[model samples]
Structures are given as structure tokens and as C-alpha cells.
Target: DEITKKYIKDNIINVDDNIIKKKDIFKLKNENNEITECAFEYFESKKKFDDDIESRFFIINDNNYNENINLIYKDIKYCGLNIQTTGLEVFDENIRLIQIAVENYPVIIYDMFNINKKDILDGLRKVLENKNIIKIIQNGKFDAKFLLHNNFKIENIFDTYIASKLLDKNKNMYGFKLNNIVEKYLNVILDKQQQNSVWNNSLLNNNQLFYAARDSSCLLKLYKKLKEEIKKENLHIVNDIENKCILPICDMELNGIKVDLENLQKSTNEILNELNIEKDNEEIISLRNYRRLYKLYSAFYLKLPLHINTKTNKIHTTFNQLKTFSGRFSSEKPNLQQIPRQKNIREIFIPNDNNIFIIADFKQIELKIAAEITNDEIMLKAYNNNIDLHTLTASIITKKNIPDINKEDRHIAKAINFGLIYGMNYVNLKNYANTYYGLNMSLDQCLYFYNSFFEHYKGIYKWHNQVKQKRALQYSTLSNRKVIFPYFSFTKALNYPVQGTCADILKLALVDLYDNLKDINGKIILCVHDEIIIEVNKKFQEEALKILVQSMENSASYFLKKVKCEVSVKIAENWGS
Candidate 1:
């Protein structure tokens, strides 16, 4: 409502079919010739789009379906496909219709409701399975699930959402909605009044048909526009990897990690009892632990069990592959990513019978990447020498010898290491020392350690200074994964490459493992940032561990060649040690 009001206040046209391209509204004021011409083209395109609406829609409900499907399939290099499902909930979701569009070709609506299921299914399978034909989609994961649910397989997929993300330099400010993207590229306002209407009706109204048909047609145009922009920006490699990763990511979400319900319930009860007994504790450490335990307990106790599919006896999570601007994956439907790090809580995740879970975690992944990127000699020497990083940092921070640094002091150093990566200042660091370690430090004391740490790592200081000078941030890792921040501060610039490179390595490792494990008896069940947990048959456990180590190490070297990083592997019946 506020946005609409602001648009009206600015005299921005609420685009419609009959609206005139008046000068004040259509003309871009004080712009260069190119921009003004582009603005004029926008208005001209809007006018043409309004007048060019044609009845290029056909319902496949007859024996002529095969011939029509064949004609659509032949010599088609690219086409737009979209699936309309019955509901928003994944559990009870069913495909209502599948729409496909090609340039100058009538949009074909495979009516799942009133048509023969076999005919439509076979027709779609033929087109989707054709490797030569690229099928463009919006949010392919959501549609792919429904397609797979009905026993259909799709290949050569190009997701416009992922493409748009690659093309968009500032992810936060870019809107990727189909309607919004259409307006930006095609300059035509899509009528979304029929969007929320019933899809399972005996027959779709003209409004619904037009809406559905336009969706696919608009996607066709948007895909072309996005492809051109992607090439112009030299983001083809990034877009290619992201697009290829869509399939495996969708499969991983569908084949979710297994949770041991019995163990989970017992762990939940124990945590609850502890929290209930210590409810009045005011100590920061005790309160923090209590809150952490409460969150861990409630997540599995209340949320996980409710989402478990009754048929599969597994909680299927959803991964928004393109949601994170940093090229990282995000999870929902019990949020497996944010699961607590408590030992007992982790133990609740178990493998299937005769299988054991192997956790392969990259050791000091982001820090090592940061070291390599900045060429931080001190940190690189520490990592290269196989020195305990936290203990080393603790010795420096506390002005004590490495041998004198105890476990609690090392914990403080660990905080400082990650804190620096996140661009923590002295104020936050002082409070952190008090809250995390119960060590009260004045601003002067905190500043001493903060400055000293940087002094010791001169290379990191140089890196930070260079990034700060750039002002506008852009980073591309060895894997060709790129993240662009049109506007960012020194801290964000420092963090992006370290965080983004680690994310890139993890994703590459995931894709590699998924591809190689196709012939193995193991499958990746969970990805928690830098860690990957695979459920493997007892027979293939050794091979799985070997593959995991090799894959992660290879992925890591993409950023820093000849700088080897360790991948720690833990094998057990449960997820935890």
C-alpha cells in the first residue's frame, strides 16, 4: 500500500492497456540520448505488447496431442516451461497444469485436470528428456518437485531466477519476481488478478488461460534478456554452475537427512529438565547455555517431528539455492542449517540400518581462504606449520607463551579469530569478552589486543586497506563463483571473499560428490555451511570417506593452489562423535 501510494505521489504510471505515453510520465528527465531513447523504447514496447495479445493457447485434450507435441519438440532449441500446482504446501501438492511456450508458437497448456494423464505425461517427458532442448523455468526447484512427484524427469533446465541473480550485481536491491522482472525487461504490466484463483476448476476461465500463457511467454523473453545480460557481465560460468547445481540441490532436499525420533525425544526431555531446574540463573554464561539448550530442544522437539512425512518417515527440508547473495544455500522446513551444535542434540541424527554417517568438515576453511587471498604470512605460516590457530592467537592476545595458554583462553582467541572475519570492532569485542568468556575488559584493553592482532598479521591489514579503497565491492573465487556488492563498507569487503570462497568450495564439493556418488551406496543428507554429512552403507564407508577428503581438498585448491587444507572425517552410527 505504501509503495503504491509513493508511486502515485511520484506520478509514476500504473501501467494499463489503454494508458497513454504522456511526456512528463514517459520521458526520463535530464538523461543522456541513449537513456532517453531507452525510455522511449520502454513506452513503445508497452504499447506494442498491449496491442499484440493473441490467442496462442491450446489445450491438449485429444489424439492430436502426439502430433502437436512432436511439432513443438522438433528443431526447438529453447522454450519456457512452467508448472501450476494445486497448493502452496509441499506435502499435499499436485500439478494442475503444465504450460510450455516457444517463440511464434502457440502456448500449449497440458491440462492435468480434464485431459488424459498418460498422454500429457508422455508428451512432457519427451520434451524434458530431450537434452538438446533447453527448458527455461522460474524457481525450478518448486516445479521440479511436483514434476518428480508425478514420476516425470526433466533435464537441461535453465532457471530464470538463478540467471537473474547472476546478472544482478546488487542482489539485495534487485527484485526477481516473474511479474516484476517482466515489467523491467518487457515494459509490460502483467495482470496478476487471476494469479491466486483456483487452478483445479473443471475449466479455466479466459483470464486464467491468458495469465498462465503469458507466464511462460514472458519467461521466454526474460530468459533471452537475462542470457544477454549474463554474457555482457561475463557471468556465464557462475550462471552455468548455479543452473547445473539446481537438480542435485532439489534432489538433496527431497532426500532429506534422517532423524532418530526416539533419541531426539529423550534429548529434548533432558534439555528441558535442565532448563526448567535452572530457570532463575542470572549469570551470562548460564543464561546463554540455557537459551541455547532451549532452542536446540524446541527445534527438534516441536518443529522437526511435525514436518516428518508420514509415508517417508523423513523430514523433507527445502533449500533455496539462489536465495543467499553470497552463493550459499539456505534451508527451511525444520531449518537443518541452524541446528544446534550441542553434542547430544547432534546425536539425534542417525543413518539408515547398515549405514553409518560420515561427517567431512573443512578445517579452518574461511580463515585459510582469507589467509591465501590476503597472503597473510603470519596466519599462512601458522596454518602451513600445522600449528593450533586458536592456541597461537591466544598466546598473542594474552601476552603469554603458547604453552601457557589454557583451554578457556584458547576459546577467547577462537572468538577473536572468527570475530575479526565478521569485522567486529573494539566495542563489540569488549562486550563479547564479557559475555562469551566472562572476562571483563576495558575499551583500552580490548583495543590493545585488536591492534596487536592486526600488527602481527600485516598482510591482512594490507588486504583490508586495499578493499576499503575500492568502495564498491566485487569478489570472484577460484571456482569462478562471483558476488557483487554495488555498495559496501571495509568490513563487508573483507568478509565477502573469505565467506564467499568457502561457500564456493563447499558447493563445488557438493556437486562433485553428488556426481561421483551416483554409482556408490552413499548419499549426502546434510550440508551445514563448510561441513557435509553423508549416510553411507557400511560396505562403502571407507570409500566414501576417501572420496569426501579428495573432493573437499580439490575444491579448496581451486582458490589456493598447492596450499593443502585438512578435511577432518568422523564416522559413527549417529551424526555426533
Candidate 2:
């Protein structure tokens, strides 16, 4: 073997302990900090979590568990479920307790001490397997991951976190936490004080029981309120996208992308050595940047061995569907979405034995979205004929013959094309061109091109003018996603559907590809915005590619009526070029 496990173990310090300890406990400064300090100081002889939690709603796991299940099952038109767990940062992740809330039935809580009971699993199977009865929760992916891992099939599930995001465009408006949503919708102040307390103890406390019961109890109310808002706004398309991708996203989180630790280490060494060279103003800044990269790589990947799941030998990430402003997927734990953009960084992530990574990307999709949404004849004609659209844009702006445009000119055009499509202004365009593309254009030139672009593509010009005219400026976009003004940027009317639809389509493709590759030996291991990377059995490489391409194209084509969706696929040994 080129890389030895011994080498990795010797080089990498296990960072799991610290990461888990901080995450398991409360992580706020205001009250949590003071309470946590007191709890620790008094933990030796502590009787309850601080004082106690007062709530009437309850759960029971007693001698006659079967009868309990029957009562809940019979009364349950639907139910709420939540599970608290000791994470992998602790002892290989333990299920601390399970809380279930059903109408006309006493809530039930099963401690890990008795969770192994035969009746418990059977009862859960009976309740959760019923397709007609929907299970409600806030941010249930963590719950679903644990359930699915235990071979429990969760059907007809609704997440209040996902539902809440659909009704409100701003992520931080009220936030997506259970306590956050409950206060806003139900006007009830939920006591999450015991939330970060001891769950690993064999003896369950009354405070912990109340905390768990309250979490499960609040979901049906939140879902009921969220459902009415979703219904009134008619945001089912956006809502449906989040729901379908739950399992697929859960599976992707469970099935992590393979990481080559040796390459990770090697990349680290090169960067550290590069930072080693001492050279101030320009070199000082260069030295400063290099040191910054060194810190980030060390923080994210240097202790890489700690993050990998032992049995699978791959790093697991928690993917959030409602993480970003545009509804794009974001990864947590390591935040795999935010990795070094360099090739060597990606080279560490390779396919497994006899499996190749098929990376499928949507080619110039945002530009095509711009064309379809604006219906600019110049843009449509350029895209429909498969002309060098960027080059054509260059020609139009610079007054150069299409064939006479050079590489730098086309690059400038490409920058402008992306800049304008997103509705950036002259100064913003100049800054975007500099920051994102490393191309420095003058404010004069950006403004000149800004005016020239609209003059040539009059459709987009008129579209921009009409953004304030309709729906009281509460933009109900193409994909039926509504964004109220003052809460979002004005240009969102132009780019919200374009960007949101990109996420919407990716999620659809994620669901389709997940199902298409369900029986096949493949997993959608990573999603970096528009590109999806699937690791499949080498035998099924072509099969996976076909499914990936078709799924992406079909999803895009269905969403964009006029634009032709093109997918470019590459079979690679690693994620990097």
C-alpha cells in the first residue's frame, strides 16, 4: 500500500474528543456559559439539570409496552417523533432516548437501557411503517439518519425546519430551530435548557424527560401552522423538493465521499513547506495568505483521520437542505462544501475499489437560465444555435467580429455575462470580476459593458425594469418560490429563480439519481452546487453516468421550458482534474 494506516495514526491526532465534547454540550455564551459552569462546578452532587423543567406533556416506557403502542397506534391520526443521541464524538454514537407523541395517547419515551426490547422495535415498525400517517418533526434528518441506520423505514415525514424555510426567505429571520419556530408560530416559550445536558447517563432525569417530550410534542403544532402558510402561499413545489431529497440527502450524509488520507497529508506538507519560505509588502502579504491557508487546512483536514468512520473508512458529513440563501446544500462537521479550491485538495478524495467517481456538471446553466427567464433574442439565438455565447457576448460589447475575439476578450465577456446575469452593478461587477475571476476591469469599462449589455439584450433590460411593478414587489418567481422585499435583495427577482431553480433541480436530480442508483452499487457521495459526484461500481459506471445525465437533464428541461439543458460528464479516479 502506498499509504499505511500506521503512518496516518502516527501523524494525525484524533480531534474527535474535543469536537464532540463542545458539540454535545451547550455552545452559547449568554446563559449557557454561566449555567454550564455552574453545572460543572456542581455536577459532582447535582440532583437535576440546574433546577427542573415543568411541562405536562409526557412519555412512558413501562412493563406493558405493547398496550402502550396499541393506544398510540389507535389514536394516532399522525404522530411526532424525536431522538436524542450521544454523538460519535463520544462512544461511537449511542441512542440516548426516543420520544413519541400521538393524539389522545400518552407520549412514550424509551431509554437506551430498555431500547433493545423486542416489542419496542416492532412497535416502532408498526407506527413508522404506516405510509398514511405522517411523522412530523423539526430538522428530522438527524432523527432519520439514526432511524434508517437502525433499519427503520420512515415514510410520509415532514420537517418543520424545512417547512419554515419555504415560508420565510431569510435564514436568520426567525431561524429554523425548534425553539425558534415554536415561539414565532405558537407563541410558546420552549425550555431548551436541558437540551445540552447529560443524556449518556443510565438513570434518566425528570428534566431530561421533559426536555425530550417537549421537543416531540411541539412538532405537530409547528407543522400544522407551517402547513397552513405553505398552503396559502402555494409553495408546494419548493416544499416537495425539500421532502423528496430528505432520504437521498440522508443517504449521502451516511455514505460519505472516500478520502485518501495520504494525499491529504501530502498536500498539507507542501503547503506548510511553501509557508516556510520567509520573504513583506508583497511577499509579506503572500506569506500572510499562505499561513492562513496552512491554518485552514490544518483546522479542516490535517486531523483528517479523526473524521473518518472506522468501518466505512470514509468521512461522514451532515448535509443541510435549508442551509443557504438560494436553497443549495451545505455540509457540516467538516463543511465539505467549503474545501480548498485547488486540485491537490480535491485529489485526496478518490473512488473506492473497482468504483470510479463520475462527476456530472451542468454546463453554463445559469447563463441558460438567464436566457430562458429574460427570453432575450440575442441570448436565445446564441444558446439555441450552440454558438460561443460568451464569445458572442464579447463581440456584442467590444464590437469585435465573433471570429476575431481573442482569449482575454472572451474571458472578459464571460466575466461580464455572469456578472450581469446575476444583476450586479458596475462597481459590483468590477469587484466581482476582480475577486472571483482574478480579472481586473475598470469601473469605467464595467459600466460601459453594463450599459452595452442591456442595449444589446433588451429583453433582460425590460425584465429588470419590471421587477418593482408586480406582486407588490413580493416576487413570486418562476419555480413558484416567493421572496418578499426588504427581506431580500431587489435583484433577487432576477436571479432568485435562476439560482433557486438550480438548487431545486439539483435536489430533484438527487432524488431521481438516488432512486435510479438505489439497487445499483453506487452512492451520490458529493454535491458541490450544480455538479453531482457519484461513486459507482466500475461495472455500473456507464449505467450510473446514463442515470446521472438523464436525471440532471430531465430535471432542468422540465424546469426551464425554452432552454436546452446540457450535462457534461467525466469519469475520474479522483474528484480533481
Candidate 3:
């Protein structure tokens, strides 16, 4: 009853006392003198005409809805488009339905399975491709890819998910799932039991139609709410990147990197052969060797092949922009980002002919970012002076002068540098040194390095203390990239700003590259944490490298203010090279 009353109040419907009374039948008359009869009954119908779809929905079967399309969307500036697929997989068949919702209008649901191709092209394609009509979608990445799979172009989109995240960065990591947002703002608990129901059925039941309608219709409402909140928060920059820059990321996902099938095949066979020898005797098998072999086998043989698109002859991976709590991009469907950088494994990713790969990596980005964040004079001085950081750390750790540091000791310092950034304790640092650099150290020696590290970089400890005293973790990068923890923790507060700022810089650089290279032949094929790989024509390699380095440096400076963010660029034919 409250819901009904609120709905009436919102719509400003003037009702007489009898209308709200125990009346089963009534007459509704509008100010235009138009009268409509309404009744209450146990309505259950599968037929379209039996339901009230006439007013809002057009059942596109064999080329219908041209009139319906113009009637509602002729002059509308924006509409919400939501697709119901047979399953969650992008390669899944049967686009069950496509719903378009506009404000002050009923949602239009198209039964794609029943509709012919020409009708779909005539009705749905026309609307989706219309540049003037901005399509508001939730997780537009998924929907846009699906649209692309069917040869439809999703030109303009206002992603509600992205906009909502911009409004609240805390929710960016997890909380802003669609249902939660709806219930949080609109106070409506949707009946989602029909969500996973058979969507590609010959006839969609009324419940399915209702669910689909709400799914798309709610987007427009959510966008309106989130847009207002974004305005209130003055986060238009975040909104702009999330809305505009993500389209190119979508294109990057579609234009997946080319894989060297012959190399991958050979690598898979080699790993299989190695595994066969390692597991010849099950009882006497070395568990460590077995695990390593099996992992390599799975990565090279089982998993890598599964991700190759049969049609495109390329490896397609999904990049999640908001996957991590710290705002780093994540990849799955082969987990390309986490692939072991073994020569054979990385060599499998080859550039197209007439093009070469350009790999540019930020040199000690997180450390420089940490230095700038904490205002650590020692660290900032070393970076500014262009001194070797790990070598200097080796001198401090080994109690030897910087000139006397050797290769073995420098490797240990490398581990210390990274492990400390990740909040490693004495025991973990000791283990990392022993495992990674074969530097077996006693606990006392480990403590010496650990204590000395903080002693040398006292600013870091001071920053940590300041963070602890605040009792809340709220920090932003130089570009106003915010990260708010739901619950504060010492380690998270210390590392988040350093790591999260690096992520912010990378994302900004990606957007910059996309904008600068929009008309060029070069394309950003891969982003592996702090490194970006571009596939470019040999003719334009130098120009591409210059732009890539400039973009990365500029992005880093935006966040790592007062510090030099150095980058290293190298050209190669294969990823491993």
C-alpha cells in the first residue's frame, strides 16, 4: 500500500476516496477527456495481445515496430539498452531479448529469437547505431561486446555502473552490484527468480517480460539518480573517464592480440613431455616438480587454447576495469596478465606481420609513487639523482658501500624493495630472499635489514604513523583518484596509496594513448601491470614509442608529483624479446 501510494504521489494522480476504497472496477479519465476502463482479475496470459504490451512494447516477429520505434524514440535524446543472453559467456548463442527503455515511456522489448534478421537490423540496429541517441547501459562492456558480436555498433553509452562507481569509489570494488543499487536508492526489491530462467524459449512468459522490462527500465532511473549524485559530488572527471574512455577499452578487448599458434603448440607439447617424464612413477613423483609441470601444462596446453577465438584466430581475453579492490585491471579467460614471463610462454604472443611490438615499462613506479606520497627525502633524493635504487638498497642492507655491491646482493635488495612495498615482515622478507635470491639469512640478519630499511627511510614510517592516527583510510592520488576502505587496516592503508596511484596512472595513460592513437595504425594490445605493450607498424615504430613514453611519463607525473617517473622502452618482434 505504501508503494502504491508513493507511486501515485510521484505521478501526481488525483484520486477520489472511492478509487482507493474496495473497488474492483473503475474508470480512469485524464484531463484530455480520454477515458480508460480498468479491472482487477487473476490475469495469466502467454499471448501478447492478452497482456498490456500494446501501450509500450512492440513484439518484433517478422518486421514490425517501425511505427512503434518512431512513436517513442523519434525525438528522445537517450535510451537504456539491456540485453538478455542465453548465458553469461560472451560466445554464447541466442540473444534472448533486447530491451530499450526511455523516460516517460514504456520499455520496448524485442524477441530476437522470433524476429527475422532484416527486422532486427531495421528496428534494433537503427536505434543502436544512431549517434545522436546516447544509449545508457549498465556494464556497457558486456552489452557492447554482445552487440558487436552480432555486427551491431554501440557508439555512445553512459554506463550506469561506471557512473555509480564514480559517485562512490568505496562501492567501485564490490558493493555497487545492480540489485543493491536499486534497493539502496529506489527501495524496490525485485523478483529475480526469473533472471536465470529459460530466456531463449519460443515464448517468453509474462514474468520474464516483466523482469526484462524492469532490468532495462531501472537503468534510466539509476542513471538519473547516479548522475545527480555525481554532480553533487563534483566528480565529473571520474565520470568522464568512466563514460568516454571505456569505449576504447572495449575496442581493445575486441581487438585481441594475435597468438603464435605454432609456438604455443610447441610449447604445450614440450610442457606435456616434461610433465610425462616428471610423473613417470606416481609413487616416487616429486610433488614440487609435478605441480610446476602441471601448472605449465595447463597454462600452455589446456587454458591457452581455450581462449583462442576460432573465428578471429586470435586470443581474446576479458579485461575487468573494476575487478580489484585497489582499482587494478584484471584479465581472465586464460589470465593473460598473470601468465609466467617464461621465454616460451611470452613468445607465444606475436605481433601481426608488418608490425612490431613496443614494450614500455615504468621503472620502479610504485617506489617513486611511495616516495612522493610519503615525501621521503632519502628515497626522493636517490630517484632525483638518478642513482640505482636497488644497488643503493644493497649497500644499506649488506653494510657495504654502493660501489662494492655485487649481482647476488643486488638481487636480494630487489626482493627487499618489492617485498617492503607489499608490507613484508622480517620472516617473509627472509623467506623471499632465500627463495628468490638464494640468500639464506638468519632471523637476526633479517631483522637487521628490516630495521635498517625503516631507519634509512624514516619518512615511510612517519607516513604509516600518520595513516594509523587518522583511524580512517581515505587517500587520493595526484589526479584525485580516491580509495576509501570499508574497514581500515595498517598494511592496506600503507600500500593502497602507493599501488593504487600506480594503477590510476596506468589507466590514465591508457585513455591518453587511445585518444592520441585513435587515427593511427598502432594499437595498445596489452597492459601488464606497470607495462604497456603496443603493436605498431614498423614505419611508425619510433613515433609510437615516443608517444607511448610521453603518455606514461605524463600520467605518472600527474600522480607522483615532485618525482621523476622514468620509463624504459624496447622494440621486439615477440612479447618475450
- Model 1: lDDT equals 0.71
Native-structure RMSD, model 2? 12.6
lDDT of 1 by residue, 545-571 (tens): 888888878778765763578898888
| TM-score: the better of candidates 2 and 3 | 2
> What lDDT does the true structure give each of the candidates?
0.71, 0.71, 0.72
Minimal lDDT window, size 10, model 1: 37-46
362-477 per-residue lDDT for model 3 (tens digits): 98887888888888898889888987779878988888986777987888788888777656689988988888878878988888888998889888878866777987867665
Q: Where is model 2 more than 4 Å wrong at Cα?
A: 1-63, 71-77, 87-91, 115-120, 171-176, 189-197, 278-313, 398-406, 424-451, 468-473, 485-493
The candidates, ranked best first by lDDT, are 3, 1, 2
Q: State model 3's lDDT.
A: 0.72
Candidate with the greatest TM-score versus the true structure: 1
Which residue pairs clash in candidate 1? Answer: none
What C-alpha lDDT, on a 0 to 100 scale, does residue 381 get in candidate 1? 83
